[PDB]
Amino acid sequence: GPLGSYGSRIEREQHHLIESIEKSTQYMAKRRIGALISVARDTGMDDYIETGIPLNAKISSQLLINIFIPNTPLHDGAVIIKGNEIASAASYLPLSDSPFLSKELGTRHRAALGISEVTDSITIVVSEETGGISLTKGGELFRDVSEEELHKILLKELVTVTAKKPSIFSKWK
Numbered sequence: 001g002p003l004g005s006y007g008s009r010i011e012r013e014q015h016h017l018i019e020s021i022e023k024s025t026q027y028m029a030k031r032r033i034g035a036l037i038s039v040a041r042d043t044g045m046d047d048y049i050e051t052g053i054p055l056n057a058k059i060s061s062q063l064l065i066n067i068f069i070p071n072t073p074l075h076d077g078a079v080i081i082k083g084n085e086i087a088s089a090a091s092y093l094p095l096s097d098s099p100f101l102s103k104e105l106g107t108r109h110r111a112a113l114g115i116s117e118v119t120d121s122i123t124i125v126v127s128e129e130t131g132g133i134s135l136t137k138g139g140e141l142f143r144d145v146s147e148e149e150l151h152k153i154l155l156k157e158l159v160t161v162t163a164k165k166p167s168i169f170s171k172w173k
């Protein structure tokens with residue numbers, strides 16, 4: 001239909017971002033494909049975006065999956081989502097030095113914890129070892145969250161708009 005011809009709607013974008021993370025991480029977890037997706041919020045991720053390959057791409061579960069396929073140019077690092085775009089892939093993030101992080105967790109988890117210690121980003125990790133999905137926020141790790149738990153956290157942290165009249169002009173950034 002005609003809606004979408006002239007712009008996009010922030011709450012549609014936010015729910016689509018959540019759905020894209022949920023579907024891609026489920027797809028990857030079932031197949032034991034590791035992944036690392038960091039969603040920028042109020043704290044900028046711009047410097048870490050610059051360390052990766054720029055994509056500036058529309059968000060989809062399909063593109064997120066294709067990025068993380070092992071042994072490919074884009075898989076070795078973080079995807080960073082900024083606004084309504086996959087900004088970069090194969091980005092560096094700071095590694096946490098915390099001795100509280102379990103030694104059985106790998107670089108993706110330590111990078112997710114590291115970025116969470118210095119930004120307000122929300123970061124999602126898929127373990128290649130177990131398929132467990134984890135999330136970091138504010139220096140804390142939520143390990144092996146269920147699909148229901150992941151859904152509730154993503155809604156609370158990434159949706160900032162309630163049920164209201166749709167408009168391409170809402171909450172401009």
Ligand SMILES: CC(=O)Nc1nc(C)c(-c2csc(N)n2)s1
Pocket residue numbers: 036075076077078091092093094095107108111
């Ligand atoms: C200082 C430093 O190394 N930072 C890193 N960030 C990320 C996102 C990394 C990563 C994920 S998966 C892989 N092979 N490497 S390493």
Ligand SMILES: [Cl-]
Pocket residue numbers: 002003004005006007168
């Ligand atoms: Cl429109």
Ligand SMILES: [Cl-]
Pocket residue numbers: 003004007008009012013
């Ligand atoms: Cl839209």
Ligand SMILES: [Cl-]
Pocket residue numbers: 023024027061062
């Ligand atoms: Cl898909």
Ligand SMILES: [Cl-]
Pocket residue numbers: 062
């Ligand atoms: Cl498809």
Ligand SMILES: [Cl-]
Pocket residue numbers: 093094095096
């Ligand atoms: Cl580092």
Ligand SMILES: [Cl-]
Pocket residue numbers: 034106107108109126127128129
């Ligand atoms: Cl892993």
Ligand SMILES: [Cl-]
Pocket residue numbers: 032129130
């Ligand atoms: Cl297994």
Ligand SMILES: [Cl-]
Pocket residue numbers: 145146147148
């Ligand atoms: Cl589950």
Ligand SMILES: [Cl-]
Pocket residue numbers: 166167168169
């Ligand atoms: Cl309008």
